[PDB]
Amino acid sequence: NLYFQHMGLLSTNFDMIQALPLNVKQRVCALKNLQMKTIQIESDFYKRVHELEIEFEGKFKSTFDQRKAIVAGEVEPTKEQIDTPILEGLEGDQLAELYKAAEADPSAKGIKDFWLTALRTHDLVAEAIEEHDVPILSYLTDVTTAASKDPAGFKIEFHFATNPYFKNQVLTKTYLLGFDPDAEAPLQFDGPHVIRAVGDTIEWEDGKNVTKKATVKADSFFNFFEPPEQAEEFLELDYEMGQAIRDTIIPRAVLFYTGELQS
Amino acid sequence: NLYFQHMGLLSTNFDMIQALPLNVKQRVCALKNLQMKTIQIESDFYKRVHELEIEFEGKFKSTFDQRKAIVAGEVEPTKEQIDTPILEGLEGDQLAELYKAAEADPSAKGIKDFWLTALRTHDLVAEAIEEHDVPILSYLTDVTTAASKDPAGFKIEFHFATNPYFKNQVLTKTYLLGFDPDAEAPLQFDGPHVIRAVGDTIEWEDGKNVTKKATVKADSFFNFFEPPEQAEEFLELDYEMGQAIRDTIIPRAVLFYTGELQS
Ligand SMILES: [Zn+2]
Ligand SMILES: [Zn+2]
DSSP states (O other), X not given: OOEXXXXXXXXXXXXXXXXXXXXXXXXXXXXXXXXHHHHHHHHHHHXXXXXXXXXXXXXXXXXXXXXXXXXXXXXXXXXXXXXXXXXXXXXXXXXXHHHXXXXXXXXXXXXXXXXXXHHHHSHHHHHHOOGGGHHHHTTEEEEEEEEETXXXXXXXXXXXOSOSSBSOSEEEEEEEEEOSOOTTSXXXXXXXXXXXXXXXXXXXXXXXXXXXXXXXXXOOGGXXXXXXXXXXXXXXXXXXXXXXXXXXIGGGXXXXXXXXXXX | OOEEOSSGGGOTTHHHHHTSOHHHHHHHHHHHHHHHHHHHHHHHHHHHHHHHHHHHHHHHHHHHHXXXXXXXXXXXXXXXXXXXXXXXXXXXXXXXXXXXXXXXXXXXXXXXXXXXXXXXXXXXXXXXXXXGGHHHHTTEEEEEEEEETTTTEEEEEEEEOSOSSBSOSEEEEEEEEEOSOOXXXXXXXXXXXXXXXXXXXXXXXXXXXXXXXXXXEOOOGGGGGSOOOHHHHHHHXXXXXXXIIIIIIGGGHHHHHHTSEEO
16 A cells, blocks of 8 residues: 655655755666666566466456356256365365255256355445345346457456346446556556546436436446546546456455355 | 455355255355366466566666665766656756755765665554664665575565674575465465565674563564564564565665655
8 A cells, every 4th residue: 555745845755855965866866767767667567467467368268157157057067066165164064064954946047146246245346236236236147357458458347147127238347557657657657557447338228227316326336337636536446446356356256155255 | 455264154155155055055166166277277377477577577677786876876876867856746946946955965975874764664664663773774785676486485685784783794584485276275375375484694793683682582673584373474464574675665765765655
């Protein structure tokens, strides 16, 4: 957790800097020059990390695709998959007692409310989920993420089964990232910074728009798909929510579903 | 900020899991199997990031070496370096008034107390610095870091000029990292985890050991060089301090020196 003072006079060590002899002051300005050269090299490092993310996203894809098929009930688990304990840290007696706690229900297909439960177990995303959002999020069949190089950034895709709230099958949110130091504040470069977020138009069915109420803006998770010193921090909170989904929830969804992982 | 429940029965959604029909329960165990495959692929990603860090550490080295030469007074700034503003966000009047606030002092060599000031402006490291540590840290000429692949991990090196407190020129702290998921808790893999920290023997001069007091353990930053549910969290705090130095302070030292960056 860092903080940049965009104005020099407000620095915490300003009195010390001001009292430095001009001799010493010019050495500090040389270090500011050197610091920019460090920043430019750091920028190339982060671009290489971003490319590495793209390479491993293709490697990740099949295991996420198999997760979706299981959640949707399109494939049934193999016996190796059934042999994996549902929870960690149990005993054989505790595990056997768990499996004997509820007989099979052939009418239950897939894993109902998987992504709703996983999202609601992350404390940041759960606070954005209102009650009128809950029955819509139960149609979530998948949540995916992929990074891009041409427009630099990443996107998050929310895949919805056919539902009476909107016609969209995939709701996409895109963040455009800047990987270069910005000419207006080059020494503040901390890595890829969000330039702007782009949402998606939801084709609501009549009377189902949970983002509006009687008409004024209503509190809804689905305002996530209409993105905008207050506007700068508003984009920061929106970007942090997107990061929680891409970096934390998506790769470890089942751990949030069981509640073994909390964040 | 995450939290793993190493015991399944303590999960926040345990009651929901327990009540799932065995039919649905076996699908969740398939997802635990798939989650491990995701983790194994993530492990290879982090190894590739670590190798990328090693590649760019060689690229970073010359700008850090030039910083050390300026801090030590071995080279004087060029006119391009002098043309870089000492602080960001000023005016030409404010910048000119800053440079006129103290005439040159030819007896002042380099930048005195550069690394002491930078470390003390980071709030985590400053809390570990006692007053008897301050005159020792003024002999700090450089603080460097480098990652390793053969023993996987990284080290931090504290370079000290000849001083009356100890004979060591370089004090090294090494962290050994594990990049594979651990067989005792594989689903808890969050990336490279610290296995153990290795410090360094300080050859104190007589009566100068600030880590001892009248004899019992004294509070001193230099206990950082004698590393060890309490011992696990003790290594975590020691590792977080090493991370603050490697990841935050070292790459942006001059910004902590001026106080334009706070963390
Ligand atoms: Zn990226
Ligand atoms: Zn590394």
